[PDB]
Amino acid sequence: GEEELQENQELIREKSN
């Protein structure tokens, strides 16, 4: 699964690069 790590908001600021 992948609904147990939402607090990685340093990379996923934009979803293309």
Side-chain angles (χ1 to χ4, degrees), residues 1-2 5-6 8-9 11-13 15-17:
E2 30 91 320
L5 21 185
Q6 296 236 152
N8 313 100
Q9 288 287 305
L11 214 66
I12 307 170
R13 296 93 94 255
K15 222 146 67 226
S16 225
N17 195 29

